[PDB]
């Protein structure tokens, strides 16, 4: 991955497809991990997205991949980043119920809509979809158009959302194009791109994907990803091991206090070692 | 309310009860508002807490009351505050099913437990419970002990939580005391206080309360309150009106960009006026 090249494509076209983002054992392990949640149906509750953190670090580590961080840093012009959201989801074929197309929309907004988005600099949002099955035109491909400003459409429509009806925005639907991709490919896109998910045309099978999005902390009304966990929880061990494996630049996206932060004292270094035995505290020592 | 006096009681004892925080029409309107959600049962789904924002600003405005902000600013030593959570809840009597006591616990932790809490300065958390019914010993009073450090108990127990079992911490249960309060009273407490909810002993009726908690933005791994809303939503009008009514110091707790923030430009001032017609933009003009 060439961070500057990918960030330039995001800026100009709104999206970039990275083939072979995962290969080898990393791909095999990620596929196995997501299949623990969404097994080969060969289901109602299994249509729901499952939020981070997952039961396997073969999924948890990917939204924080150093290559992804590098792209986002180049596009936004800041290193002060946060993971906004991450989840896994399966989209099932027609044998498992009616599958519908989403409306074209942007994802430029924070969840609360507290203030209107900006599509420039540190206010941009970057989305990723890591496909863990081969995606064809009959397995619910993502559709993309272009950045909203390039298309001359507003981020807030007259209907009061970031979605574009077919009756009001016909040209968007004529220009949309599907993204087909091999398993292990990563689609990156900016939140202000006009895009949608699509219906899974095929009868059997399901599309498997890991989703995430990242924002700059300067957009302070935006929430980072919310989850609840305590050391007593059965899933804590996996998360604890994730924190030990991550480098400081990656933990930063979870809101971890950075080197030099006032949080760090002899007592909090001690408590960090207690909660995450084996963690490297040297970057944080006062 | 005397902010410095209340903050001193919070620092020394861990809690302070403010009688008559709401009086007059403000109290009557808040009671009516919460009763739209939890009517006089004279219910299963009605036992669930409902999160902010509410359908009435007679509830939404209270976690942001200037008097509450002043207390928290004095205790934490910073004005860079965020609302962590707010919700309303009813606790029903025994006629509506078995009511149980919570274990004593602290609420010193962020939801993700990402790093261990600090109970000093800007890392303190402040909780409020605004009681909207009269609370007696038979209507599920809050129980309090004292700050964890004062009691010599850890914020992380050997069980891996912030809760204190009766078998491991018997002295805490012998020292706990109920808080009785008239309707319109506000209980404030620090997150590191050992406390619990209790069973509603009475057969009929329910306790009504509005809950909120606030933290300092320096504790950057902590999440501010998460909600989803867009201008198309039926509840947007109420929230829009709330934003117009609030002063800058209050909007700050929602993550609103402060005066002088790089977010503010001619274009974003325009978009702010469009989304919140009538809002005073003068504090934010570049």
């Amino acid at each position: 991955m060439d961070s500057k090249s990918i960030a330039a494509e995001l800026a100009t076209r709104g999206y970039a497809l990275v083939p072979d983002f995962l290969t080898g054992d990393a791909l095999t392990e990620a596929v196995a991990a997501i299949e623990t949640y969404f097994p080969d149906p060969e289901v109602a509750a299994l249509k729901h997205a499952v939020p981070f953190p997952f039961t396997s670090n073969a999924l948890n580590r990917h939204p924080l991949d150093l290559r992804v961080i590098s792209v986002v840093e180049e596009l936004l012009g800041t290193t002060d980043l946060r993971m906004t959201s991450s989840f896994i989801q399966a989209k099932y074929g027609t044998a498992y119920g009616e599958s519908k197309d989403q409306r074209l929309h942007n994802d430029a907004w924070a969840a609360s809509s507290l203030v209107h988005p900006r599509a420039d600099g540190v206010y941009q949002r970057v989305y990723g979809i890591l496909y863990l099955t081969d995606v064809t035109e009959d397995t619910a491909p993502t559709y993309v158009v272009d950045r909203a400003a390039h298309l001359g459409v507003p981020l807030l429509t007259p209907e009061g959302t970031g979605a574009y009806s077919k009756e009001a925005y016909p040209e968007l639907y004529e220009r949309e194009r599907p993204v087909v991709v091999s398993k292990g490919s990563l689609l990156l896109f900016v939140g202000d791109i006009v895009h949608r998910g699509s219906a899974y045309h095929g009868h059997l099978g399901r599309r498997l994907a890991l989703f995430f999005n990242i924002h700059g902390a300067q957009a302070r009304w935006t929430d980072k990803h919310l989850w609840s966990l305590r050391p007593a929880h059965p899933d804590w061990g996996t998360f604890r091991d994730l924190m030990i494996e991550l480098e400081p630049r990656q933990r930063h996206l979870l809101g971890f206090p950075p080197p030099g932060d006032d949080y760090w004292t002899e007592e909090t270094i001690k408590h960090l070692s207690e909660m995450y035995p084996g963690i490297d505290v040297e970057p944080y020592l006062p | 309310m005397d902010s410095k006096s209340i903050a001193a009681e919070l620092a020394t004892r861990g809690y302070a009860l403010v009688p008559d925080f709401l009086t007059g029409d403000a109290l009557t309107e808040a009671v009516a508002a919460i009763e739209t959600y939890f009517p006089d049962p004279e219910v299963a789904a009605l036992k669930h807490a409902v999160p902010f924002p509410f359908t009435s600003n007679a509830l939404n405005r209270h976690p942001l009351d200037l008097r509450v902000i002043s207390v928290v600013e004095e205790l934490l030593g910073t004005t860079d505050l965020r609302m962590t959570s707010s919700f309303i809840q009813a606790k029903y009597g025994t006629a509506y099913g078995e009511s149980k006591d919570q274990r004593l616990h602290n609420d010193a932790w962020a939801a993700s437990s990402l790093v261990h809490p600090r109970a000093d300065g800007v890392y303190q958390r402040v909780y409020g419970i605004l009681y909207l019914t009269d609370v007696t010993e038979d209507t599920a009073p809050t129980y309090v002990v004292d700050r964890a450090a004062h009691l010599g108990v850890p914020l992380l127990t050997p069980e891996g939580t912030g809760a204190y079992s009766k078998e491991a911490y018997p002295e805490l249960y012998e020292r706990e005391r109920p808080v009785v309060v008239s309707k319109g009273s506000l209980l404030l407490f620090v997150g590191d206080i050992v406390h619990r909810g209790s069973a509603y002993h009475g057969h009929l009726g329910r306790r009504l309360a509005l809950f909120f908690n606030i933290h300092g933005a320096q504790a950057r791994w902590t999440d501010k309150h998460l909600w989803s809303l867009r201008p198309a939503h039926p509840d947007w009008g109420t929230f829009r009106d709330l934003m117009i009514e609030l002063e800058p110091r209050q909007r700050h707790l929602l993550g609103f960009p402060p005066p002088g923030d790089d977010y503010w430009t001619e274009e974003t001032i325009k978009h702010l006026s469009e989304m919140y017609p009538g809002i005073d933009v003068e504090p934010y003009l570049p």
């Binding site: 989840f87 969840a111 | 998460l226 989803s228």
Partner: peptide, 15 residues
């Protein structure tokens, strides 16, 4: 809908 938090007008939503 098909998420884990808030509501999309049907059930819990992606956030």
């Amino acid at each position: 809908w098909y998420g884990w938090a808030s509501n999309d007008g049907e059930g819990v939503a992606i956030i």
